[PDB]
Predict the 3D structure of the following.
Amino acid sequence: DYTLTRIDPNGENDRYPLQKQEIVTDPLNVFMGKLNDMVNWGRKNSIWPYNFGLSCCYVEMVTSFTAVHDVARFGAEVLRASPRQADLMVVAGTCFTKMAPVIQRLYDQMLEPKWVISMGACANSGGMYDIYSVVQGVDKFIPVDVYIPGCPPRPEAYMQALMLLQESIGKERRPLSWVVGDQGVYRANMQSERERKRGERIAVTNLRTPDEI
Amino acid sequence: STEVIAHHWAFAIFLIVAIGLCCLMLVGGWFLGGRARARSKNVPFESGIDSVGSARLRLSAKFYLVAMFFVIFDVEALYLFAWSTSIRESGWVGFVEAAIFIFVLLAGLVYLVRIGALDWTPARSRRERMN
Amino acid sequence: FEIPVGGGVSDCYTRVMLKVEELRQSLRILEQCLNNMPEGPFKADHPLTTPPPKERTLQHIETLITHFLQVSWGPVMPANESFQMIEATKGINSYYLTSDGSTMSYRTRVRTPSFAHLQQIPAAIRGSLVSDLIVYLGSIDFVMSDVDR
Amino acid sequence: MTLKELLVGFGTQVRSIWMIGLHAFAKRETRMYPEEPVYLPPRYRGRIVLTRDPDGEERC
Amino acid sequence: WISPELIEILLTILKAVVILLVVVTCGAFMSFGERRLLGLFQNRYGPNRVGWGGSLQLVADMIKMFFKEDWIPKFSDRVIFTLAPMIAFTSLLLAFAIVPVSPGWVVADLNIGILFFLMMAGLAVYAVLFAGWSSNNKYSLLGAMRASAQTLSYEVFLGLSLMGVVAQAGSFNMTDIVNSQAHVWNVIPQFFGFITFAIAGVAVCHRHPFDQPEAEQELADGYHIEYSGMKFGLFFVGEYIGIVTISALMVTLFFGGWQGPLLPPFIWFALKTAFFMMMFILIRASLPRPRYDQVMSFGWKICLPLTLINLLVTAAVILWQA
Amino acid sequence: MEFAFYICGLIAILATLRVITHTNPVHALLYLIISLLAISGVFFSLGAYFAGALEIIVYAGAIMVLFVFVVMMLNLGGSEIEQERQWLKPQVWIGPAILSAIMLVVIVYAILGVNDQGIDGTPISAKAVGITLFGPYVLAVELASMLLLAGLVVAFHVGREE
Ligand SMILES: CCCCCCCCCCCCCCCCCC(=O)OC[C@H](COP(=O)(O)OCCN)OC(=O)CCCCCCCCCCCCCCCCC
Ligand SMILES: CCCCCCCCCCC1=C(C)C(=O)C(OC)=C(OC)C1=O
Ligand SMILES: CCCCCCCCCCCCCCCCCCCC
Ligand SMILES: CCCCCCCCCCCCCCCCCCCC
Ligand code: SF4
């Protein structure tokens, strides 16, 4: 229940992303597993987002940074202006066709490990902008770890996606060093949130009427 | 004595352990974790688009005159550093000497300010046009 | 409500403080909105009111027909050209609409103020420091959705 | 700059430091998602559902 | 090896090692403390989830920083690029090595003292200069030029701001400086020296409002853009150690050091140093950033004549009362 | 004391030799920093504590100005390195090499015949230097202020734009 990705920027593959993915089994012993868990804990509790925004979704993400939401509580407020110091790229906005090589370049300039959250309907699929100048989803060329529906997602939806990314990071397998060992990145194939929440969602019967505050 | 040589050894061990701790953290950062590979990874960051030229250029600073003046004024500062540790021994005569020295220093500073030697702001950034 | 005006110089500081006074004036307008709120309909009685009032849609057949056609094929606007200019948050925003008689706009032209302000940028900042340009960008009050539409 | 401008600027810096330091004694404005749930008004536009009539059949 | 001299030597060595470890730990835990105190000043919490009260946030950040890819760019001068974080880490640590934190607790009781601090600050500028130049980045080169401009602004009067305290103590030694404040702390007679040293010492660490080499709004973090992993962490750990050192020097020179009526001397020293660390955080939270030409004008036209006139008045007072 | 003197002097000699035969200007400035730090360590080993402190203090600022000027003019990538490396040839250095060597030989021969009781390294304090500086050397202080004033005026008149 793991997908292994191996990157190959100079291989015989031109289409982005320059990577290959294969469904494998969990590679994980009594000490390497514990130290991998410690590295995953440290990485998931210190996620520095890239100060990068395309449209209105960025306004909601930085709203989550402020005092009324305080995403600092999760340890994810540091907000680096440099791609080298950033761990998380939030595609917060429309992937405009003119902006797509820029997004690819900025993703290339980030360093390992890196995660991608596609925030909002535009970044997810193109959203309402099925139009000549808009790429229909940033996952046409960027591998995406978490998708947030919404236009915009509210700041707590961005926080919920941050927690989802934390659970995905906490059970991933990455090279502990670049000198010795397997260097491919193993990501757990999680149960979908739709299937997880289906039981409590279908059981809803009555909601408040839209007539009061 | 003994406290002096103890403090000398303490200073030596302080410097050695500080430099060794810095080197150890650099080595641990270098060897731990994976590495990223990308086509444009080894391109300098300029907000996502290629550079025009590079950072290796004749970039003209505007405060170079102030840099010369800073070197001069730092030497004047060391003269005052020598005076300030022995003010009671030099007496009022040393005070008169340092007053003349400081007055010549301040007259040179006033001269530099008044001739515009310390001004390098462009004319559109001098903030003359206000309500 | 008052319209705050500057002394003759459009500064970064003057633009920001003018927007502060505009915020206070909008607070005055909101106080008047809270105190004197008319009782009446939230939708016009016109046949082209899209969609019609929902309760009448849910129980009256002709209203249901109007709703059905308005949300599916669309409301039919007779062929004309229309224009509306408003004071938006960042300047003057306008819509220029051409109907050809269909349920879709033949032409929708949106004039936005941020386009003009960003074009003004090189004339007003030429010969300044970079920090002045940072402050200028902060004081223009623009977003790029407004600029590029 | 003038002497009055220097003194006034010193006073304004002191005032800014003082007011932020007094914000250190204020009540927190944070709504602590996810420990306290987000309040949403009843007509908030989030996840879409299909509903049933009072007889239990699907309304669609 | 049973002799009083040798065991006194190892006791002094152990005390110096303890001082070094506590200062480095205080720099890292004050990165965490800056986050929590900024949350406090901005009506929020800051990191309070990872561990009890966020106490394990520093550990998580350290693990992330260690296992981040610590890279050296192919377009950079590799040796200078690696050397600049080492200078940024070590210079103001060595400047701390003259701070007497308690009677009997000082690493180096140097005869030069505050001269050694000036030596280390003058060496400390080269970290930002080398980081800006070696990284071959345009924003980083602009940050390096801004850092040199800042050094021109403050270094002309930093030592002169300390010279009134030096004149009152009659010595460069820092224990003599805290002994001269047995009755009145130097913040009362050397008040103008105090404010000029506060300005220049904030400018020493390139801390806000003098963070022009790393100005995020202008230079997109400037001189350390190409740094990542533990070299970036080295730059910020050195910055926080510099905050600790400048606060402790301010306490030592202007606030009596460890002298106080009731508490143990280290408690007084730690309380005053913690207060000025909090003041570093608060001025980062409170006041805006001036233009760097305005900072140069302020340093050369206001602060330097103030330090010169302060030294003259201090000497006249000393000789009048002698 | 002698350990520090000999090692700091060796480091200063090697770093200065690296300075005068280097192509990269920023690297040359770094080796100049290292050589001046080593000469300051030599000063500290001889008891001249004030001189060593001032050696680090005023050359850290001075080489910073040299870095400013090097960034303004010299640094261009490999163009100035190629131009400077082509300016250095075996003949160009071997010419003045024996000249400097025989000057050093004559100066060293004159040095070795002097009466030497050894430098005990007793520290001469900054207070004593300040007492001498504002005592017997008052006119030196005031005319040095005039000298630095002349340097200021010359730098302003020459190093301008228009
Ligand atoms: C242990 C170490 C840490 C200690 C922590 C506590 C102390 C922190 C000290 C922080 C220092 C901040 C200093 C900032 C100086 C900025 C000066 C400057 O450049 O101001 C520019 C501004 C306008 O510039 P102008 O020259 O008028 O315009 C020319 C335009 N081309 O000019 C003006 O606005 C004019 C007024 C300038 C005012 C300068 C600041 C006054 C001193 C600092 C604030 C007070 C701090 C507390 C002091 C003690 C209080 C008891
Ligand atoms: C022993 C090694 C420990 C390394 C820990 C490094 C932690 C660095 C955090 C500093 C910091 C950064 C970079 C930062 O960018 C930032 O935002 C302005 C802060 O305040 C919220 C910070 O506190
Ligand atoms: C925020 C304060 C930072 C202080 C940094 C320097 C501290 C170095 C470690 C000192 C440890 C010993 C303290 C004195 C011991 C004797 C007194 C004990 C009772 C207080
Ligand atoms: C283009 C002009 C270049 C001028 C370079 C000048 C170099 C001069 C080198 C002189 C070397 C002298 C070596 C010793 C000679 C014998 C002793 C002196 C004469 C008796
Ligand atoms: S998804 Fe909606 S809110 Fe987000 S960028 Fe697109 S239009 Fe803006």
Observations:
- The pocket of iron/sulfur cluster (ligand 5) is lined by residues A 55-57, 93-94, 120-122, 127, 151-152 (CB under 6 Å).
- Chain D touches chain E through 15 residues (CB under 8 Å).
- The two ends of chain D are 75 Å apart (CA to CA).
